[PDB]
Amino acid sequence: PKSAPLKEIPDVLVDPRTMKRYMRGRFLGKGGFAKCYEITDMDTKEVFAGKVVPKSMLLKPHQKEKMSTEIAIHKSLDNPHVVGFHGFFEDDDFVYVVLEICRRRSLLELHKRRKAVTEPEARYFMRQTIQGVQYLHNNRVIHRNLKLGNLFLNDDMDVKIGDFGLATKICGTPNYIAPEVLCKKGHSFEVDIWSLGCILYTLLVGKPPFETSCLKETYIRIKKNEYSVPRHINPVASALIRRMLHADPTLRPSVAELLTDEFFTSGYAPMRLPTSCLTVPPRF
Amino acid sequence: LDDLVAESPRKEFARINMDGIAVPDEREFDIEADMRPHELEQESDTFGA
Amino acid sequence: THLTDMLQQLAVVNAAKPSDRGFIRQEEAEDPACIPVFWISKWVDYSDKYGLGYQLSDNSVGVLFNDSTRLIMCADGDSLQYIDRNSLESYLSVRSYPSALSKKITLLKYFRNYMSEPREGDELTRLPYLRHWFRTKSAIVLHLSNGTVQINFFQDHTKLILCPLMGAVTYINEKREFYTYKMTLIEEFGCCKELASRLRYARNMVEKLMACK
């Protein structure tokens, strides 16, 4: 065998630097080797999401390097469409990270219940996500792992981009990989643009543009830029998807020109969504 | 299926409208409803404590 | 499709015999990301006269009337959805309705009244509705339009809520604690005897749902 027995997580998490006490509540899920819990600040009763990372899993300098980068980048962020960073601290056994809670989970869960969403809903989610990406890119941060699963939803259905594990400020394996990364041409902000393309396709079509049963065919389709937008999607959205998913990163749009595409400036664009949208189509 | 004491209407064999049904006094509805199967998940008042 | 896919998911977990393991690790099958968006918090079986009335977990309410129509009222106590015999869904308000819905509106309010103890965006609220139900002496089973199947056990006041879309099962115990599990993970890590028997029971209940129609 080749692993130490897991340490148990304290019932109360104390930040000695600020003397704050967070009562560990219910399990929220486990992402990578971290486990997340609902934590409650016992003086203020504010509730947060506590990411708990065992040090046993941070042993090599490369892993510590990684964690520290995710953290430095994320704490440098403050935007309504990015998951709020509320601090970090540590004992002998764990690194504890205090995050804005998103009780309505993620756009992946929404995708699983709804499959294809209505075009107005797509507008709403993509606009909010893109304003997020605009902020990140304006701060020279490339996310590099944008996917359904790290587009979080709060109780007002605002989108929060989280999971800065692969982020860098100007790797592991991203969900949607851009062709330039695969071809090893190096890569830049345009990578995020590609992923948004894959997300928009997915929100409107109901399935991913490239991913299939076998990983190696996915890769080929991505290199060759082989995908098809179904006929029932309208042209305006279809053209936006094609731009976003262009084989050449230099020819994908800037994040800055995304919100002025005709897909966003035409069509009904609700400014708010009810939580009912998590499970079934809205009124319209 | 014999365990089924009650079920939703099978559109094929159900009444086609509710014109035949009289609307009661709310009081009688409430009294009879108390004698109907139901779950209201009442959780008791703790009076601030 | 919902029921079929659910049946097949339940057959698969049950056939893995998840409680017949030397060492059960139920807690590894937990998936809080799959917590249900809505469930039925209350119900009244007035089906000898009007139909079945219910309340969802967001405090909206609904009634499945004995003519196979449904009327649903949102939490705002004003916005209604109506589903007619041919499943056409109409949106209206309680201030403004066809005179043919007049009795149903009154009935609905009564149910609502009996069971009771507006930002931007709320106007877009549309709810799933009750498609079928049946009751026995020990349980009630409820199937919503979003694929959720809910089983209330009367004896111990417990619930199961199953979703074929998330492939998930939520158990609500006496103490009113929600636990949500991925059924493929229950297959891998196992679950206790009590849950396993409730999953068998659920497969049986779901068969009974498919057999009525």
Answer whether A touches B (≥3 Cβ pairs < 8 Å): no
Contact residues, chain A, for C37 at CB < 8 Å: 113, 275-276, 278-279
Tell whether A9 is covered by a domain. Answer: no
CA distance A122 to chain C (A): 15
C40: amino acid identity, one letter: I
Split into its structural domains, chain B has a count of 1
User: Does A209 reside within a domain?
Assistant: yes
Interchain pair A273, C123: CB under 8 A: no
Question: In a 3-state reduction of DSSP, which class is residue C82?
Answer: strand
B35 in contact with C at a CB cutoff of 8 Å?
Answer: no
For C13, the 3-state DSSP assignment is: helix
Pairing verdict, β C178-182 and C168-172:
antiparallel
Q: Residue B22: helix, strand or coil by DSSP?
A: coil
**Domain assignment present for A119:** yes
- Asked whether the beta carbons of A128 and A81 are under 8 A apart, the reply is yes
Q: Where a domain ends, among C107, C127, C147? A: C127
**Is the Cβ of C193 closer than 8 Å to some Cβ of chain B?**
no
A98: domain CATH number is 3.30.200.20
C134 & C53 share domain:
no
| Domain end position, chosen among C108, C127, C146 | C127
Looking at the fold, whether A249 and A185 belong to one and the same domain comes out as: yes
Which ranges constitute the DSSP H helices of B1-49?
Answer: 26-34
- Parallel/antiparallel/unpaired status of strands C40-46 and B38-39: antiparallel
> In angstroms, rounded to a whole number, what is the distance separating the alpha carbons of residues A240 and A250?
15
Which chain C residues are closer than 8 Å to A281 by Cβ? 126
Phi-psi region of C4 (alpha: psi -120 to 50; beta: other; left: phi over 0): alpha
C-alpha–C-alpha distance, residues C139 and C198, integer Å: 12
Q: Could you say which of A82, A105, A128 is where a domain stops?
A: A105
* C127, C147, C164 - which closes a domain: C127
Whether the CA torsion B20, B26, B29, B33 is positive or negative: it is: positive
Q: After which residues is chain C broken (C to N over 2.5 A)?
A: 117
Resolution given for this structure, in angstroms: 2.3
* Pair C95, C107 in one domain: yes
- Distance in angstroms (rounded) separating the CA atoms of residues A220 and A227: 11
The residue among B28, B35, B39, B43 with the most chain C CBs within 10 A of its CB, best to mutate, is B39
Residues A198 and A230 in one domain: yes
Shared domain check, A127 and A38: no
Is residue A51 marked as binding? yes
Burial of C128 (0-12, 13-18, 19+ CB in 10 A): buried
Are C134 and C163 within one domain?
yes
Residue C54 belongs to what domain range? 41-127
User: What does chain A come to in residues?
Assistant: 284
3-state secondary structure of C86: coil
3-state secondary structure at position C122: helix
C-alpha A262/C-alpha A270 separation (Å) is 16
A276, part of any domain: no
CATH assignment of the domain containing C54: 3.30.1120.30
Nearest to C151 by CA among C47, C4, C36, C25: C36
R_g (Cα) of chain B, nearest Å: 17
Helix (H) or strand (E) segment spanning residue A122: helix A119-138
Q: Does residue A247 share a domain with residue A110?
A: yes
Query: C160 CB near a chain B CB, below 8 Å?
Result: no
Q: Are residues C65 and C161 in the same domain?
A: no
A34 and A131 share a domain? no
CB-nearest partner of C115 from B9, B18, B40: B40
How was this structure obtained?
X-ray
Give the span between the Cα atoms of A152 and A36, in whole angstroms: 14
Q: DSSP letters along C130-195, please?
A: EEEEEE-SSEEEEEETTS-EEEEETTTTEEEEEETTTTEEEEE-TT--EEEEEHHHHHHH---HHH
Is there a single domain that holds both residue A112 and residue A32?
A: no
Query: Distance (Å) from the C-alpha of residue A282 to the closest C-alpha of chain C?
Result: 5
Does residue B27 sit at the C interface (CB-CB below 8 Å)?
no
Specify whether A22 is located in the same domain as A148: no
CA distance C34 to C38: 12
C151 neighbors C158 (Cβ within 8 angstroms): no
Backbone phi, psi, residue A250, to 5° = -65, -20
Strand partners, C50: none
Q: Do chains C and A touch (3 or more CB pairs under 8 A)?
A: yes
Sequence-separated (6 or more) residues with CB below 8 Å from residue A71: A88, A97
Judged by CB atoms closer than 8 Å, whether chains meet at B36 and C42 is answered as no
- Chain C neighbors of B36, CB-CB under 8 A: 44-46, 48
Cα C120–Cα C124–Cα C106 angle in degrees, nearest 5:
110
Using CB atoms, pick whichever of A29, A157, A283 lies closest to residue C126. Answer: A283
Which token pair is C143? 């199937």
Asked whether C181 and C26 are in contact (CB, 8 A), the reply is yes
Judged by CB atoms closer than 8 Å, whether chains meet at B38 and C42 is answered as: yes
Same domain? A67 vs A120: no
- Which residues of chain B make contact with C135, given a CB cutoff of 8 A? 4-7, 37
Residues C147 and C195 in one domain: yes
Domains in chain C, number: 2
Please list the residues that pair with A79 across neighbouring strands. Answer: none
Q: Which residues pair with C65 in a beta bridge?
A: C51
Measured CA to CA, the distance from residue C101 to residue B23 in angstroms comes to 12
A146 and A36: one domain? no
- The answer to whether residues A72 and A138 belong to one domain is no
Burial of A278 (0-12, 13-18, 19+ CB in 10 A): buried
Copy the structure tokens of residue C64: 């499945």
Chain B hits for C114, CB-CB cut-off 8 Å, are 29-30, 33
Residue A6 is assigned to a structural domain of this protein:
no
Spatial separation of the C-alpha atoms in residues C124 and A142, rounded to whole Å? 34
**CA A24/CA A21 separation, integer angstroms:** 9
Of A43, A73, A105, which closes a domain? A105
Structure tokens at A105: 């989970």
Provide, as residue numbers in chain B, all residues whose Cβ is less than 8 Å from the Cβ of C173.
Answer: none
Q: Using the beta-carbon criterion (under 8 Å), do B6 and C134 form an inter-chain contact? A: yes
Question: How far, in Å, CA of A97 to CA of A233, rounded?
Answer: 41
Q: Does B38 touch chain C (CB under 8 A)?
A: yes
Q: How far is B17 from chain C (nearest CA, A)?
A: 5
**Within this chain, do residues A202 and A246 fall inside the same structural domain, yes or no?**
yes
Question: Which of A102, A105, A280, A284 best probes binding to C when mutated, by most C CB atoms within 10 angstroms?
Answer: A280
Range of the domain at A122: 106-268
Alpha carbon distance C196, C75 (integer Å): 35
The pair of structure tokens assigned to C186 is 């229950």
Which of B15, B26, B39 comes nearest C66 by C-beta? B15
> Residue C189 corresponds to which tokens in the numbers above?
């890590």
**Crossing angle, helix A235-244 and helix A190-205, to 10 degrees?**
150
Number of domains into which chain A is organized: 2
The nearest CA of chain C is from the CA of A14 a distance in Å of: 25
Q: Look up residue A221 and give its two tokens.
A: 């389709």
CATH number for the domain that contains residue A140: 1.10.510.10
Q: Say yes or no for a CB contact (<8 Å) between C37 and A278.
A: yes
